[PDB]
Scaffold this motif. Structure first.
Motif, PDB file in Angstrom:
ATOM      1  N   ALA A 158      45.066  43.085  41.191  1.00  0.00           N
ATOM      2  CA  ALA A 158      45.042  43.258  42.776  1.00  0.00           C
ATOM      3  C   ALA A 158      46.431  42.330  43.287  1.00  0.00           C
ATOM      4  O   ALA A 158      47.305  41.955  42.486  1.00  0.00           O
ATOM      5  CB  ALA A 158      43.593  42.857  43.439  1.00  0.00           C
ATOM      6  N   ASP A 159      46.339  42.439  44.607  1.00  0.00           N
ATOM      7  CA  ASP A 159      47.613  42.003  45.226  1.00  0.00           C
ATOM      8  C   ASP A 159      47.660  40.567  45.624  1.00  0.00           C
ATOM      9  O   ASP A 159      48.701  39.660  45.287  1.00  0.00           O
ATOM     10  CB  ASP A 159      47.937  42.803  46.501  1.00  0.00           C
ATOM     11  CG  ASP A 159      46.663  42.938  47.421  1.00  0.00           C
ATOM     12  OD1 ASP A 159      45.798  42.095  47.055  1.00  0.00           O
ATOM     13  OD2 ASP A 159      46.851  43.323  48.619  1.00  0.00           O
ATOM     14  N   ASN A 160      46.829  40.052  46.443  1.00  0.00           N
ATOM     15  CA  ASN A 160      47.056  38.707  47.242  1.00  0.00           C
ATOM     16  C   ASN A 160      46.647  37.622  46.032  1.00  0.00           C
ATOM     17  O   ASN A 160      46.473  37.631  45.164  1.00  0.00           O
ATOM     18  CB  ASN A 160      46.086  38.655  48.269  1.00  0.00           C
ATOM     19  CG  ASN A 160      46.352  37.637  49.405  1.00  0.00           C
ATOM     20  OD1 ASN A 160      47.185  36.939  49.146  1.00  0.00           O
ATOM     21  ND2 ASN A 160      45.609  37.499  50.214  1.00  0.00           N
ATOM     22  N   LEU A 161      47.041  36.466  46.630  1.00  0.00           N
ATOM     23  CA  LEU A 161      46.873  35.010  45.930  1.00  0.00           C
ATOM     24  C   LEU A 161      45.333  34.820  46.043  1.00  0.00           C
ATOM     25  O   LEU A 161      44.906  33.927  45.158  1.00  0.00           O
ATOM     26  CB  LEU A 161      47.454  34.034  46.867  1.00  0.00           C
ATOM     27  CG  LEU A 161      47.650  32.577  46.148  1.00  0.00           C
ATOM     28  CD1 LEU A 161      48.331  32.587  44.875  1.00  0.00           C
ATOM     29  CD2 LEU A 161      48.256  31.573  47.027  1.00  0.00           C
ATOM     30  N   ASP A 162      44.550  35.439  46.839  1.00  0.00           N
ATOM     31  CA  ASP A 162      42.860  35.214  46.973  1.00  0.00           C
ATOM     32  C   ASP A 162      42.141  35.840  45.855  1.00  0.00           C
ATOM     33  O   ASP A 162      41.085  36.165  45.913  1.00  0.00           O
ATOM     34  CB  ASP A 162      42.430  35.486  48.146  1.00  0.00           C
ATOM     35  CG  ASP A 162      42.421  36.799  48.555  1.00  0.00           C
ATOM     36  OD1 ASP A 162      43.234  37.464  47.833  1.00  0.00           O
ATOM     37  OD2 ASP A 162      41.654  37.283  49.521  1.00  0.00           O
ATOM     38  N   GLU A 163      42.728  36.260  44.738  1.00  0.00           N
ATOM     39  CA  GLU A 163      41.963  37.008  43.747  1.00  0.00           C
ATOM     40  C   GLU A 163      40.884  36.530  43.044  1.00  0.00           C
ATOM     41  O   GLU A 163      40.120  37.421  42.432  1.00  0.00           O
ATOM     42  CB  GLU A 163      42.994  37.541  42.833  1.00  0.00           C
ATOM     43  CG  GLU A 163      43.874  38.595  43.340  1.00  0.00           C
ATOM     44  CD  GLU A 163      43.305  39.583  44.519  1.00  0.00           C
ATOM     45  OE1 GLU A 163      42.254  40.275  44.206  1.00  0.00           O
ATOM     46  OE2 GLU A 163      43.749  39.656  45.572  1.00  0.00           O
ATOM     47  N   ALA A 164      40.665  35.102  43.232  1.00  0.00           N
ATOM     48  CA  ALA A 164      39.497  34.737  42.783  1.00  0.00           C
ATOM     49  C   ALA A 164      38.155  35.230  43.458  1.00  0.00           C
ATOM     50  O   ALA A 164      37.111  35.427  42.970  1.00  0.00           O
ATOM     51  CB  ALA A 164      39.374  33.182  43.259  1.00  0.00           C
ATOM     52  N   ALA A 165      38.674  35.931  44.877  1.00  0.00           N
ATOM     53  CA  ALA A 165      37.370  36.558  45.576  1.00  0.00           C
ATOM     54  C   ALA A 165      37.094  37.929  44.996  1.00  0.00           C
ATOM     55  O   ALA A 165      36.050  38.567  45.462  1.00  0.00           O
ATOM     56  CB  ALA A 165      37.828  36.546  47.000  1.00  0.00           C
ATOM     57  N   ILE A 166      37.775  38.313  44.012  1.00  0.00           N
ATOM     58  CA  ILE A 166      37.659  39.519  43.260  1.00  0.00           C
ATOM     59  C   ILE A 166      37.459  39.407  41.840  1.00  0.00           C
ATOM     60  O   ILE A 166      36.778  40.241  41.111  1.00  0.00           O
ATOM     61  CB  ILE A 166      38.854  40.578  43.498  1.00  0.00           C
ATOM     62  CG1 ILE A 166      38.881  41.039  44.944  1.00  0.00           C
ATOM     63  CG2 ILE A 166      38.798  42.047  42.676  1.00  0.00           C
ATOM     64  CD1 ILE A 166      39.691  40.113  45.933  1.00  0.00           C
ATOM     65  N   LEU A 167      37.795  38.512  41.221  1.00  0.00           N
ATOM     66  CA  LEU A 167      37.457  37.932  39.902  1.00  0.00           C
ATOM     67  C   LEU A 167      36.038  37.380  39.877  1.00  0.00           C
ATOM     68  O   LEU A 167      35.220  37.537  38.805  1.00  0.00           O
ATOM     69  CB  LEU A 167      38.399  36.763  39.166  1.00  0.00           C
ATOM     70  CG  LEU A 167      38.112  36.126  38.011  1.00  0.00           C
ATOM     71  CD1 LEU A 167      39.645  36.071  37.288  1.00  0.00           C
ATOM     72  CD2 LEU A 167      37.435  34.918  38.029  1.00  0.00           C
ATOM     73  N   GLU A 168      35.537  36.895  41.188  1.00  0.00           N
ATOM     74  CA  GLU A 168      34.203  36.467  41.001  1.00  0.00           C
ATOM     75  C   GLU A 168      33.036  37.691  40.975  1.00  0.00           C
ATOM     76  O   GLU A 168      32.012  37.493  40.434  1.00  0.00           O
ATOM     77  CB  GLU A 168      33.856  35.961  42.355  1.00  0.00           C
ATOM     78  CG  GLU A 168      34.060  36.483  43.772  1.00  0.00           C
ATOM     79  CD  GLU A 168      32.921  37.333  44.041  1.00  0.00           C
ATOM     80  OE1 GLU A 168      31.797  37.104  43.508  1.00  0.00           O
ATOM     81  OE2 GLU A 168      33.162  38.357  44.983  1.00  0.00           O
ATOM     82  N   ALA A 169      33.710  38.710  41.474  1.00  0.00           N
ATOM     83  CA  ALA A 169      32.794  39.891  40.963  1.00  0.00           C
ATOM     84  C   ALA A 169      32.541  40.373  39.729  1.00  0.00           C
ATOM     85  O   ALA A 169      31.395  40.588  39.139  1.00  0.00           O
ATOM     86  CB  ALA A 169      33.353  41.202  41.654  1.00  0.00           C
ATOM     87  N   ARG A 170      33.718  40.225  38.763  1.00  0.00           N
ATOM     88  CA  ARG A 170      33.345  40.455  37.374  1.00  0.00           C
ATOM     89  C   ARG A 170      32.617  39.431  36.845  1.00  0.00           C
ATOM     90  O   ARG A 170      31.779  39.695  35.992  1.00  0.00           O
ATOM     91  CB  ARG A 170      34.796  40.472  36.770  1.00  0.00           C
ATOM     92  CG  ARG A 170      35.652  41.813  36.951  1.00  0.00           C
ATOM     93  CD  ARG A 170      36.757  42.062  36.117  1.00  0.00           C
ATOM     94  NE  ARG A 170      37.886  40.874  36.782  1.00  0.00           N
ATOM     95  CZ  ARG A 170      38.349  40.182  35.983  1.00  0.00           C
ATOM     96  NH1 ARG A 170      37.683  39.604  34.724  1.00  0.00           N
ATOM     97  NH2 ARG A 170      39.234  39.033  36.662  1.00  0.00           N
TER      98      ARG A 170
END
Lengths: 74, 69
Positions: free
Chosen positions: B16-28
């Protein structure tokens, strides 16, 4: 068995006062029973144990497996 | 980097793109944690529960094997 076990009871002071014609006025009598039955391989569904369990006010089961394991009384 | 191939070895890489990818790593993270939770929810419930119930009271049957009553 019933007419034998049913005699163990507790009587009131009026009954004992009547029985002794006034000699033992104050107190009350009693009689406690501890019948003992033996069962074959823990089969409490046999005839005599089923009859006796129905009459008494309780029971105390002693187990062989508990006796060997050290728990005495079982 | 080599004249024809670039190889990037990353400790943790997400596409993914942005710096906030913790918000998408949290899904996994949450999905894998839920799976690992439900697993231990099935290990005890299925295996350890039934397999002791079966072995509980066998001895009561084998002792009356020869009785004619």
């Amino acid at each position: 068995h019933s007419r034998l076990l049913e005699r163990a009871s507790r009587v009131s002071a009026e009954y004992v006062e009547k029985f002794t014609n006034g000699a033992v006025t104050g107190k009350t009598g009693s009689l406690t029973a501890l019948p003992i039955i033996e069962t074959q391989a823990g089969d409490v569904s046999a005839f005599v144990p089923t009859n006796v369990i129905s009459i008494t006010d309780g029971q105390i089961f002693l187990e062989t497996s508990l006796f060997n394991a050290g728990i005495r009384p079982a | 980097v080599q004249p024809h191939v670039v190889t990037v070895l990353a400790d943790t890489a997400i596409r993914a793109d942005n710096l906030d990818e913790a918000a998408i790593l949290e899904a996994r993270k949450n999905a894998e944690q839920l799976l690992a939770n439900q697993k231990s929810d099935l290990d005890s419930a299925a295996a350890l529960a039934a397999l002791a119930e079966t072995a509980a009271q066998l001895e009561t049957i084998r002792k009356i094997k020869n009785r004619a009553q």
